[PDB]
Amino acid sequence: KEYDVFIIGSGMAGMTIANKCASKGLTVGITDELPYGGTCALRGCDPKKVIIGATEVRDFAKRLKGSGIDTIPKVNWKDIMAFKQSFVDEMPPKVEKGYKRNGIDTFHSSAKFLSQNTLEIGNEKIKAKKIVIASGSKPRVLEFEGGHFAKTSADFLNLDELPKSLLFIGGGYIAFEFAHIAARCGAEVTIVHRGNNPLENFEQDIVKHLVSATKKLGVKLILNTDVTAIEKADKKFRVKGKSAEKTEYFEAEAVFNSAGRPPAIFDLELEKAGISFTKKGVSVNEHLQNTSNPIVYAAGDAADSEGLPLTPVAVLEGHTVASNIIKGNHKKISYPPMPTVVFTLPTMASVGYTESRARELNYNIQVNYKEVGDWFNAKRLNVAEYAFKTIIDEETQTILGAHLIGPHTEETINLFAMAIKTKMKVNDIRTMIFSYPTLASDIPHML
Amino acid sequence: KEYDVFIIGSGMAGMTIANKCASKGLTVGITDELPYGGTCALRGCDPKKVIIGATEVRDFAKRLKGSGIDTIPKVNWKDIMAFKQSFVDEMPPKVEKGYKRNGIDTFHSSAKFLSQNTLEIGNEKIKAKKIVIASGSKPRVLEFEGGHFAKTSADFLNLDELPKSLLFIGGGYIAFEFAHIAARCGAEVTIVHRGNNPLENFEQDIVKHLVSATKKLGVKLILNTDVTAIEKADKKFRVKGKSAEKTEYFEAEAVFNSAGRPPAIFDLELEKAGISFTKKGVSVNEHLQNTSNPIVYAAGDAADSEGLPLTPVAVLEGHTVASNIIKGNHKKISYPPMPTVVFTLPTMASVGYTESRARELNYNIQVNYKEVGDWFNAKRLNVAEYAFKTIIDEETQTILGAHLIGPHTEETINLFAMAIKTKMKVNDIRTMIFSYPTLASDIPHML
Ligand SMILES: Cc1cc2nc3c(=O)[nH]c(=O)nc-3n(C[C@H](O)[C@H](O)[C@H](O)COP(=O)(O)OP(=O)(O)OC[C@H]3O[C@@H](n4cnc5c(N)ncnc54)[C@H](O)[C@@H]3O)c2cc1C
Ligand SMILES: Cc1cc2nc3c(=O)[nH]c(=O)nc-3n(C[C@H](O)[C@H](O)[C@H](O)COP(=O)(O)OP(=O)(O)OC[C@H]3O[C@@H](n4cnc5c(N)ncnc54)[C@H](O)[C@@H]3O)c2cc1C
Ligand SMILES: NC(=O)C1=CN([C@@H]2O[C@H](COP(=O)(O)OP(=O)(O)OC[C@H]3O[C@@H](n4cnc5c(N)ncnc54)[C@H](OP(=O)(O)O)[C@@H]3O)[C@@H](O)[C@H]2O)C=CC1
Ligand SMILES: NC(=O)C1=CN([C@@H]2O[C@H](COP(=O)(O)OP(=O)(O)OC[C@H]3O[C@@H](n4cnc5c(N)ncnc54)[C@H](OP(=O)(O)O)[C@@H]3O)[C@@H](O)[C@H]2O)C=CC1
């Protein structure tokens, strides 16, 4: 079998490129070793956010207790899992039906290269004129003793019962979001992180408020401790934590792998196709084309790209690859502001540069950082943690970055994104009119 | 007593101008016939939004019932009133303390003009070089029989107990927002509106979904019926409704005046100062200066201005008046997009032009209207009503307006505001990156 385009993975990147390429009369083939839809839809952003919803109900009631609410609901684990599970189950049929409907050849096996332009799909041989690697990323294989007793983000999202005690290895997005969920549903939770700081790429002047919020929730955070072993006891697990000071041991029903997500490229036999790759994924140029094999493109978490491993980024990288495969190399990938969020309660969000990174680019900057728990918006919702840090280019009076924790920040952060992209002057923002009363109306006050 | 500036009203407009003028070394005087802070802070946006908060808790629980929540909280009227009351009581001391601190002379009586440049404050005579009318607006005096049994928006916001049955006269913002509150707290509610359409200045293709949402909530909406009398029965009120077809009578514990808000200018003896006014408020030029008396300025709901009677508008009108009083007439008032919201659940929001108004300006337009109750964002929150209408200038591929109902619309509408003001191209918006999963991420899909 010979195609114009063969795609590895039908997550956000792979789908985006299948549908677009098919639409311009190319012959399209695509395999996923798992149900079609990718990580976000099946085992990431979407199943998570559904579940977070039921926690939002408890937290909001807990917050106005005695101020007009007299009962704080317990979350019904089964019911919300079941509700989550419905969005999950309905996704693959939808996608497949879209493929058969667009004239896209569909496969359901793991893929290895046999040569430059040729693929072993399950127990078949397949060839193409252009190949795309959109296989995303996968839980880190924990190399040390007991490593394999680490359950995944995906396992977490599938649990029939919430354990009595959880422990997350690695203090990033997942550990914190899943700790909030787990804690709000009535489980003890521990996060063990080898760094001196959690959530290391966020503005620590902001992070500390979430760390505060997290601990008030009863969650244990251990810093400066590397996890080096797991041992299964009677209906328990026992975890080794190594610091400079000591080795300590932690007991919990259930241990989870939060330790970051390497690209899903290491079982692909890329060497057999003369395809250049680092440990951050497939190596790409301005056209998202591989640097040795000129017939290969990549997009999403699998791509060693200047873009953040996020759902909207996999799509934008999709469109450049799709377009360059279709018309030849003509379009260079261009990244706008890449807003990011930690779906804790309260949510934290960031866009553009941190202080530290703004200084590294030798910008003369203004910083505005303030803790504003006393502002009407935080006060009326009884959310204790509300703080912001903005970074203004002093010379052009345009925004370079903004980092927020508090109510609706996952929404509000997009206005800062729009602001950065449109190169809006700080004064045009100050004299602009918002709906009130809203969180958006606090922006003029952050400068 | 002789001042550089005397201000009538310390709501948003009056405050804004006091503080700014004082700050540039002018002598400032200011009276409010009520506690300092204005309608928004004391008897409008702020006390309302606090209360709406406790309803958000019930509605969100009601929405995920059986999907992970097993109890729908009753709202504790006293407790939330008491909570509301705290924000209300803390406002005037804050403002006064700001005045004494800025060197602002403070008065607490109703104001009438005695002449061109002269004011009767309580039982005093006062003169100024520039005078500002920032007296906002006031419930309509209901002229007909029983008119005076109509309780106010303000009375509503102050109730010790929620009645068993409410009836609102006039189907605008207040009737709908207060009906939602009242209904969610367990009272029967009726809205009586003389028009064929409710919420007449909104896009009716959107309004109808809120009308749908409102009726599913058990609220009675009567159209094409003018209210012509009220009669107090035994622990009851009985209301006359006149249509073409008939006269019908409605019984309720409590009747409220939702019938629109004339400017608070008609008891000011403006004639005695040769001050030009229509029934929409004090007549103003580009400088927000009166058109006969050249020493007078106005700002906010009291001003017959091209701006919407809203908290953020009173502020922007403040700054032009303040600035022109300070440096002389030099600055013309300029209005950006004026986002507006109906704090029902679900919220509805609008910005820029309706279809009908876009056509009136002879724009070649594209319209995108869709009901999207099936979108992930509505589905995961179980909000039945999610719909949008956008209006694109066909020629410049920039937005002219957008009208939304659904989750976080009061927030999302500001992105459309930013979009209109920054004259962002529809494609730059489509290829821009949002945080996901968020309501903001549905914008590219509305075009
Ligand atoms: C728990 C979790 C939460 C997240 N939350 C968010 C969030 O809130 N917001 C956000 O923006 N991003 C979030 N992300 C990141 C987001 O999921 C990714 O950035 C996005 O899925 C990238 O799309 P992709 O197409 O590159 O990869 P994917 O969507 O994962 O698609 C790749 C596909 O390749 C398949 N595949 C892998 N290896 C092979 C192989 N050898 N053979 C065949 N098929 C293969 C996979 O099964 C998968 O279906 C989250 C990730 C996780 C794990
Ligand atoms: C129930 C309600 C809800 C609202 N919700 C919103 C909302 O959610 N968002 C929004 O943007 N807008 C909202 N508004 C409108 C908003 O309140 C006004 O646009 C805003 O208050 C205008 O400010 P202003 O300074 O012109 O008037 P005000 O803020 O009312 O200030 C005028 C002041 O003048 C005083 N005064 C009046 N007459 C006299 C007199 N003769 N002598 C002395 N003092 C006098 C008044 O007591 C008052 O303190 C709402 C209004 C109401 C009634
Ligand atoms: N809202 C969103 O946008 C979300 C996005 N995601 C996506 O998922 C991925 C995030 O993965 P996540 O699991 O949070 O990991 P992160 O990379 O965010 O952080 C994990 C941390 O774990 C530490 N760690 C590694 N090994 C150990 C160990 N043995 N003991 C203790 N700590 C250890 C690492 O330290 P070190 O760095 O020093 O090696 C690292 O800092 C990204 O692709 C992200 O885009 C995840 C959820 C939410
Ligand atoms: N979220 C926000 O921004 C909010 C803003 N506000 C502010 O408050 C004001 C809105 O006042 P509101 O009370 O909602 O009034 P609106 O002007 O919005 O609408 C009231 C309606 O009542 C009708 N009406 C008048 N008399 C009768 C009668 N006898 N019987 C039946 N219907 C009648 C009127 O019909 P007709 O027009 O045909 O004469 C009118 O359409 C504005 O200043 C607004 O800015 C209010 C609350 C929320």
Side-chain angles (χ1 to χ4, degrees), chain B residues 80-106:
Chain B
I80 186 170
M81 259 297 325
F83 187 38
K84 183 227 72 170
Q85 200 60 64
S86 69
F87 294 87
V88 166
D89 296 341
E90 296 172 351
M91 176 54 59
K94 204 206 76 213
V95 174
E96 255 147 15
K97 193 227 141 281
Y99 288 166
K100 268 134 57 79
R101 187 222 187 202
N102 290 8
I104 297 170
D105 270 19
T106 94

PDB file of all heavy atoms in Angstrom, chain B residues 80-106:
ATOM      1  N   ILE B  80     -27.000  35.036  53.578  1.00  0.00           N
ATOM      2  CA  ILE B  80     -26.463  35.722  52.369  1.00  0.00           C
ATOM      3  C   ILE B  80     -26.800  37.209  52.390  1.00  0.00           C
ATOM      4  O   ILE B  80     -25.868  37.984  52.028  1.00  0.00           O
ATOM      5  CB  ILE B  80     -26.874  35.087  51.037  1.00  0.00           C
ATOM      6  CG1 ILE B  80     -26.118  35.817  49.924  1.00  0.00           C
ATOM      7  CG2 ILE B  80     -28.380  35.084  50.807  1.00  0.00           C
ATOM      8  CD1 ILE B  80     -26.251  35.143  48.631  1.00  0.00           C
ATOM      9  N   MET B  81     -28.018  37.593  52.805  1.00  0.00           N
ATOM     10  CA  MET B  81     -28.370  39.028  53.047  1.00  0.00           C
ATOM     11  C   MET B  81     -27.322  39.644  53.974  1.00  0.00           C
ATOM     12  O   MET B  81     -26.815  40.759  53.667  1.00  0.00           O
ATOM     13  CB  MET B  81     -29.745  39.230  53.703  1.00  0.00           C
ATOM     14  CG  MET B  81     -30.850  39.651  52.738  1.00  0.00           C
ATOM     15  SD  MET B  81     -30.677  41.272  51.882  1.00  0.00           S
ATOM     16  CE  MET B  81     -29.896  42.264  53.146  1.00  0.00           C
ATOM     17  N   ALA B  82     -27.035  38.963  55.083  1.00  0.00           N
ATOM     18  CA  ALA B  82     -26.128  39.467  56.142  1.00  0.00           C
ATOM     19  C   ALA B  82     -24.740  39.646  55.524  1.00  0.00           C
ATOM     20  O   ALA B  82     -24.133  40.701  55.739  1.00  0.00           O
ATOM     21  CB  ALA B  82     -26.116  38.522  57.321  1.00  0.00           C
ATOM     22  N   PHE B  83     -24.305  38.659  54.740  1.00  0.00           N
ATOM     23  CA  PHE B  83     -23.010  38.653  54.007  1.00  0.00           C
ATOM     24  C   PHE B  83     -22.994  39.820  53.019  1.00  0.00           C
ATOM     25  O   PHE B  83     -22.059  40.602  53.002  1.00  0.00           O
ATOM     26  CB  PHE B  83     -22.790  37.309  53.296  1.00  0.00           C
ATOM     27  CG  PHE B  83     -21.431  37.163  52.658  1.00  0.00           C
ATOM     28  CD1 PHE B  83     -20.293  37.666  53.273  1.00  0.00           C
ATOM     29  CD2 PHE B  83     -21.279  36.517  51.441  1.00  0.00           C
ATOM     30  CE1 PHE B  83     -19.035  37.515  52.700  1.00  0.00           C
ATOM     31  CE2 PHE B  83     -20.023  36.382  50.859  1.00  0.00           C
ATOM     32  CZ  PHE B  83     -18.902  36.889  51.487  1.00  0.00           C
ATOM     33  N   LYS B  84     -24.031  39.931  52.201  1.00  0.00           N
ATOM     34  CA  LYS B  84     -24.221  41.104  51.308  1.00  0.00           C
ATOM     35  C   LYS B  84     -24.046  42.379  52.130  1.00  0.00           C
ATOM     36  O   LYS B  84     -23.211  43.229  51.749  1.00  0.00           O
ATOM     37  CB  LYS B  84     -25.608  41.084  50.667  1.00  0.00           C
ATOM     38  CG  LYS B  84     -25.875  42.207  49.674  1.00  0.00           C
ATOM     39  CD  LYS B  84     -27.201  42.909  49.881  1.00  0.00           C
ATOM     40  CE  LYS B  84     -27.218  43.791  51.109  1.00  0.00           C
ATOM     41  NZ  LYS B  84     -28.440  44.635  51.145  1.00  0.00           N
ATOM     42  N   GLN B  85     -24.768  42.472  53.242  1.00  0.00           N
ATOM     43  CA  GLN B  85     -24.899  43.713  54.061  1.00  0.00           C
ATOM     44  C   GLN B  85     -23.518  44.185  54.526  1.00  0.00           C
ATOM     45  O   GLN B  85     -23.330  45.406  54.629  1.00  0.00           O
ATOM     46  CB  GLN B  85     -25.858  43.493  55.246  1.00  0.00           C
ATOM     47  CG  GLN B  85     -26.416  44.786  55.813  1.00  0.00           C
ATOM     48  CD  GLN B  85     -27.187  45.573  54.776  1.00  0.00           C
ATOM     49  OE1 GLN B  85     -28.217  45.129  54.283  1.00  0.00           O
ATOM     50  NE2 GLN B  85     -26.673  46.735  54.401  1.00  0.00           N
ATOM     51  N   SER B  86     -22.594  43.267  54.816  1.00  0.00           N
ATOM     52  CA  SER B  86     -21.208  43.595  55.251  1.00  0.00           C
ATOM     53  C   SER B  86     -20.477  44.398  54.165  1.00  0.00           C
ATOM     54  O   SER B  86     -19.817  45.366  54.511  1.00  0.00           O
ATOM     55  CB  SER B  86     -20.430  42.355  55.626  1.00  0.00           C
ATOM     56  OG  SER B  86     -20.157  41.572  54.482  1.00  0.00           O
ATOM     57  N   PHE B  87     -20.553  44.005  52.896  1.00  0.00           N
ATOM     58  CA  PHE B  87     -19.853  44.727  51.795  1.00  0.00           C
ATOM     59  C   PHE B  87     -20.458  46.129  51.713  1.00  0.00           C
ATOM     60  O   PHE B  87     -19.713  47.110  51.511  1.00  0.00           O
ATOM     61  CB  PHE B  87     -19.973  43.995  50.454  1.00  0.00           C
ATOM     62  CG  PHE B  87     -19.272  42.659  50.417  1.00  0.00           C
ATOM     63  CD1 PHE B  87     -19.929  41.510  50.831  1.00  0.00           C
ATOM     64  CD2 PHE B  87     -17.947  42.560  50.004  1.00  0.00           C
ATOM     65  CE1 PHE B  87     -19.277  40.288  50.830  1.00  0.00           C
ATOM     66  CE2 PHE B  87     -17.300  41.335  50.009  1.00  0.00           C
ATOM     67  CZ  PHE B  87     -17.966  40.198  50.414  1.00  0.00           C
ATOM     68  N   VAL B  88     -21.778  46.204  51.907  1.00  0.00           N
ATOM     69  CA  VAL B  88     -22.567  47.466  51.778  1.00  0.00           C
ATOM     70  C   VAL B  88     -22.136  48.468  52.857  1.00  0.00           C
ATOM     71  O   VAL B  88     -21.709  49.575  52.463  1.00  0.00           O
ATOM     72  CB  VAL B  88     -24.077  47.182  51.805  1.00  0.00           C
ATOM     73  CG1 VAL B  88     -24.899  48.450  52.022  1.00  0.00           C
ATOM     74  CG2 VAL B  88     -24.494  46.470  50.523  1.00  0.00           C
ATOM     75  N   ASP B  89     -22.187  48.056  54.134  1.00  0.00           N
ATOM     76  CA  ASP B  89     -21.878  48.867  55.348  1.00  0.00           C
ATOM     77  C   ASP B  89     -20.427  49.359  55.344  1.00  0.00           C
ATOM     78  O   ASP B  89     -20.194  50.462  55.840  1.00  0.00           O
ATOM     79  CB  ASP B  89     -22.090  48.062  56.640  1.00  0.00           C
ATOM     80  CG  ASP B  89     -23.519  47.614  56.898  1.00  0.00           C
ATOM     81  OD1 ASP B  89     -24.441  48.213  56.282  1.00  0.00           O
ATOM     82  OD2 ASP B  89     -23.704  46.679  57.722  1.00  0.00           O
ATOM     83  N   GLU B  90     -19.473  48.568  54.845  1.00  0.00           N
ATOM     84  CA  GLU B  90     -18.024  48.924  54.875  1.00  0.00           C
ATOM     85  C   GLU B  90     -17.673  49.981  53.813  1.00  0.00           C
ATOM     86  O   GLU B  90     -16.555  50.505  53.884  1.00  0.00           O
ATOM     87  CB  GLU B  90     -17.165  47.667  54.699  1.00  0.00           C
ATOM     88  CG  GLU B  90     -17.337  46.670  55.840  1.00  0.00           C
ATOM     89  CD  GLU B  90     -16.665  45.313  55.667  1.00  0.00           C
ATOM     90  OE1 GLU B  90     -16.161  45.032  54.534  1.00  0.00           O
ATOM     91  OE2 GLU B  90     -16.649  44.537  56.667  1.00  0.00           O
ATOM     92  N   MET B  91     -18.565  50.293  52.866  1.00  0.00           N
ATOM     93  CA  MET B  91     -18.233  51.126  51.681  1.00  0.00           C
ATOM     94  C   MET B  91     -18.185  52.606  52.079  1.00  0.00           C
ATOM     95  O   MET B  91     -17.150  53.243  51.895  1.00  0.00           O
ATOM     96  CB  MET B  91     -19.205  50.866  50.513  1.00  0.00           C
ATOM     97  CG  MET B  91     -18.996  51.760  49.277  1.00  0.00           C
ATOM     98  SD  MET B  91     -17.295  51.739  48.609  1.00  0.00           S
ATOM     99  CE  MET B  91     -17.102  49.994  48.235  1.00  0.00           C
ATOM    100  N   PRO B  92     -19.243  53.217  52.663  1.00  0.00           N
ATOM    101  CA  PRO B  92     -19.223  54.657  52.930  1.00  0.00           C
ATOM    102  C   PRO B  92     -18.051  55.123  53.805  1.00  0.00           C
ATOM    103  O   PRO B  92     -17.377  56.099  53.458  1.00  0.00           O
ATOM    104  CB  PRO B  92     -20.597  54.936  53.584  1.00  0.00           C
ATOM    105  CG  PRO B  92     -21.461  53.754  53.173  1.00  0.00           C
ATOM    106  CD  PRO B  92     -20.494  52.587  53.132  1.00  0.00           C
ATOM    107  N   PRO B  93     -17.770  54.497  54.974  1.00  0.00           N
ATOM    108  CA  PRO B  93     -16.624  54.905  55.786  1.00  0.00           C
ATOM    109  C   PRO B  93     -15.352  54.966  54.938  1.00  0.00           C
ATOM    110  O   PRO B  93     -14.595  55.895  55.101  1.00  0.00           O
ATOM    111  CB  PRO B  93     -16.512  53.820  56.868  1.00  0.00           C
ATOM    112  CG  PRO B  93     -17.933  53.310  57.014  1.00  0.00           C
ATOM    113  CD  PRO B  93     -18.549  53.427  55.629  1.00  0.00           C
ATOM    114  N   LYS B  94     -15.167  53.978  54.062  1.00  0.00           N
ATOM    115  CA  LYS B  94     -13.964  53.841  53.207  1.00  0.00           C
ATOM    116  C   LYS B  94     -13.828  55.112  52.358  1.00  0.00           C
ATOM    117  O   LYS B  94     -12.717  55.677  52.295  1.00  0.00           O
ATOM    118  CB  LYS B  94     -14.078  52.574  52.353  1.00  0.00           C
ATOM    119  CG  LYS B  94     -12.754  51.999  51.866  1.00  0.00           C
ATOM    120  CD  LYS B  94     -12.872  51.193  50.583  1.00  0.00           C
ATOM    121  CE  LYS B  94     -13.026  52.051  49.342  1.00  0.00           C
ATOM    122  NZ  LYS B  94     -13.877  51.392  48.321  1.00  0.00           N
ATOM    123  N   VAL B  95     -14.941  55.558  51.771  1.00  0.00           N
ATOM    124  CA  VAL B  95     -15.003  56.650  50.758  1.00  0.00           C
ATOM    125  C   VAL B  95     -14.756  57.970  51.479  1.00  0.00           C
ATOM    126  O   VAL B  95     -13.867  58.715  51.023  1.00  0.00           O
ATOM    127  CB  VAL B  95     -16.358  56.658  50.020  1.00  0.00           C
ATOM    128  CG1 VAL B  95     -16.509  57.856  49.087  1.00  0.00           C
ATOM    129  CG2 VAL B  95     -16.578  55.363  49.259  1.00  0.00           C
ATOM    130  N   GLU B  96     -15.536  58.225  52.539  1.00  0.00           N
ATOM    131  CA  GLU B  96     -15.453  59.424  53.426  1.00  0.00           C
ATOM    132  C   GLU B  96     -14.012  59.612  53.897  1.00  0.00           C
ATOM    133  O   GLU B  96     -13.460  60.719  53.736  1.00  0.00           O
ATOM    134  CB  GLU B  96     -16.376  59.272  54.645  1.00  0.00           C
ATOM    135  CG  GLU B  96     -17.646  60.119  54.584  1.00  0.00           C
ATOM    136  CD  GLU B  96     -18.855  59.479  55.249  1.00  0.00           C
ATOM    137  OE1 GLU B  96     -18.652  58.511  55.995  1.00  0.00           O
ATOM    138  OE2 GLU B  96     -19.997  59.936  55.013  1.00  0.00           O
ATOM    139  N   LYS B  97     -13.448  58.555  54.471  1.00  0.00           N
ATOM    140  CA  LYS B  97     -12.052  58.501  54.979  1.00  0.00           C
ATOM    141  C   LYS B  97     -11.092  58.879  53.838  1.00  0.00           C
ATOM    142  O   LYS B  97     -10.088  59.529  54.117  1.00  0.00           O
ATOM    143  CB  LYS B  97     -11.791  57.108  55.570  1.00  0.00           C
ATOM    144  CG  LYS B  97     -10.525  56.974  56.403  1.00  0.00           C
ATOM    145  CD  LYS B  97      -9.691  55.746  56.067  1.00  0.00           C
ATOM    146  CE  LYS B  97      -8.199  56.021  56.082  1.00  0.00           C
ATOM    147  NZ  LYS B  97      -7.742  56.700  54.843  1.00  0.00           N
ATOM    148  N   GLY B  98     -11.407  58.491  52.604  1.00  0.00           N
ATOM    149  CA  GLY B  98     -10.637  58.856  51.399  1.00  0.00           C
ATOM    150  C   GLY B  98     -10.749  60.339  51.099  1.00  0.00           C
ATOM    151  O   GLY B  98      -9.761  60.927  50.652  1.00  0.00           O
ATOM    152  N   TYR B  99     -11.917  60.926  51.364  1.00  0.00           N
ATOM    153  CA  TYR B  99     -12.231  62.361  51.129  1.00  0.00           C
ATOM    154  C   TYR B  99     -11.501  63.234  52.158  1.00  0.00           C
ATOM    155  O   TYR B  99     -10.641  64.046  51.738  1.00  0.00           O
ATOM    156  CB  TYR B  99     -13.746  62.582  51.144  1.00  0.00           C
ATOM    157  CG  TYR B  99     -14.485  62.049  49.939  1.00  0.00           C
ATOM    158  CD1 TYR B  99     -15.863  61.920  49.966  1.00  0.00           C
ATOM    159  CD2 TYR B  99     -13.832  61.720  48.758  1.00  0.00           C
ATOM    160  CE1 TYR B  99     -16.572  61.466  48.869  1.00  0.00           C
ATOM    161  CE2 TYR B  99     -14.527  61.259  47.651  1.00  0.00           C
ATOM    162  CZ  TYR B  99     -15.902  61.130  47.708  1.00  0.00           C
ATOM    163  OH  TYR B  99     -16.609  60.683  46.633  1.00  0.00           O
ATOM    164  N   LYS B 100     -11.815  63.073  53.450  1.00  0.00           N
ATOM    165  CA  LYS B 100     -11.083  63.756  54.552  1.00  0.00           C
ATOM    166  C   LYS B 100      -9.581  63.647  54.261  1.00  0.00           C
ATOM    167  O   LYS B 100      -8.882  64.648  54.421  1.00  0.00           O
ATOM    168  CB  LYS B 100     -11.468  63.180  55.919  1.00  0.00           C
ATOM    169  CG  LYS B 100     -12.616  63.899  56.628  1.00  0.00           C
ATOM    170  CD  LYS B 100     -13.682  62.981  57.230  1.00  0.00           C
ATOM    171  CE  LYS B 100     -13.160  61.960  58.229  1.00  0.00           C
ATOM    172  NZ  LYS B 100     -12.903  62.547  59.568  1.00  0.00           N
ATOM    173  N   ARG B 101      -9.120  62.497  53.772  1.00  0.00           N
ATOM    174  CA  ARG B 101      -7.681  62.231  53.504  1.00  0.00           C
ATOM    175  C   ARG B 101      -7.175  62.998  52.270  1.00  0.00           C
ATOM    176  O   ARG B 101      -5.955  63.256  52.205  1.00  0.00           O
ATOM    177  CB  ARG B 101      -7.474  60.727  53.335  1.00  0.00           C
ATOM    178  CG  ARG B 101      -6.022  60.300  53.225  1.00  0.00           C
ATOM    179  CD  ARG B 101      -5.910  59.252  52.145  1.00  0.00           C
ATOM    180  NE  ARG B 101      -4.583  58.666  52.087  1.00  0.00           N
ATOM    181  CZ  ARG B 101      -4.066  58.055  51.020  1.00  0.00           C
ATOM    182  NH1 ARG B 101      -4.760  57.955  49.895  1.00  0.00           N
ATOM    183  NH2 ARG B 101      -2.845  57.549  51.080  1.00  0.00           N
ATOM    184  N   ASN B 102      -8.044  63.339  51.313  1.00  0.00           N
ATOM    185  CA  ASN B 102      -7.642  64.023  50.050  1.00  0.00           C
ATOM    186  C   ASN B 102      -7.905  65.528  50.169  1.00  0.00           C
ATOM    187  O   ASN B 102      -7.550  66.260  49.230  1.00  0.00           O
ATOM    188  CB  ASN B 102      -8.352  63.443  48.820  1.00  0.00           C
ATOM    189  CG  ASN B 102      -7.894  62.043  48.464  1.00  0.00           C
ATOM    190  OD1 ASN B 102      -7.147  61.413  49.209  1.00  0.00           O
ATOM    191  ND2 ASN B 102      -8.350  61.540  47.326  1.00  0.00           N
ATOM    192  N   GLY B 103      -8.485  65.979  51.283  1.00  0.00           N
ATOM    193  CA  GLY B 103      -8.816  67.400  51.489  1.00  0.00           C
ATOM    194  C   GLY B 103     -10.037  67.773  50.678  1.00  0.00           C
ATOM    195  O   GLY B 103      -9.979  68.783  49.928  1.00  0.00           O
ATOM    196  N   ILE B 104     -11.090  66.960  50.817  1.00  0.00           N
ATOM    197  CA  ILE B 104     -12.391  67.127  50.115  1.00  0.00           C
ATOM    198  C   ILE B 104     -13.470  67.439  51.151  1.00  0.00           C
ATOM    199  O   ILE B 104     -13.701  66.598  52.043  1.00  0.00           O
ATOM    200  CB  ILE B 104     -12.737  65.874  49.284  1.00  0.00           C
ATOM    201  CG1 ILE B 104     -11.715  65.638  48.168  1.00  0.00           C
ATOM    202  CG2 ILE B 104     -14.155  65.971  48.735  1.00  0.00           C
ATOM    203  CD1 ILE B 104     -11.857  64.309  47.482  1.00  0.00           C
ATOM    204  N   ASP B 105     -14.116  68.593  50.996  1.00  0.00           N
ATOM    205  CA  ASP B 105     -15.283  69.041  51.799  1.00  0.00           C
ATOM    206  C   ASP B 105     -16.502  68.174  51.483  1.00  0.00           C
ATOM    207  O   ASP B 105     -16.866  68.096  50.311  1.00  0.00           O
ATOM    208  CB  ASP B 105     -15.607  70.507  51.517  1.00  0.00           C
ATOM    209  CG  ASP B 105     -14.880  71.478  52.431  1.00  0.00           C
ATOM    210  OD1 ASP B 105     -13.862  71.074  53.034  1.00  0.00           O
ATOM    211  OD2 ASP B 105     -15.350  72.635  52.540  1.00  0.00           O
ATOM    212  N   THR B 106     -17.136  67.612  52.508  1.00  0.00           N
ATOM    213  CA  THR B 106     -18.129  66.519  52.399  1.00  0.00           C
ATOM    214  C   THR B 106     -19.455  67.002  52.987  1.00  0.00           C
ATOM    215  O   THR B 106     -19.431  67.525  54.100  1.00  0.00           O
ATOM    216  CB  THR B 106     -17.613  65.259  53.104  1.00  0.00           C
ATOM    217  OG1 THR B 106     -18.117  65.261  54.442  1.00  0.00           O
ATOM    218  CG2 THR B 106     -16.101  65.160  53.107  1.00  0.00           C
TER     219      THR B 106
END
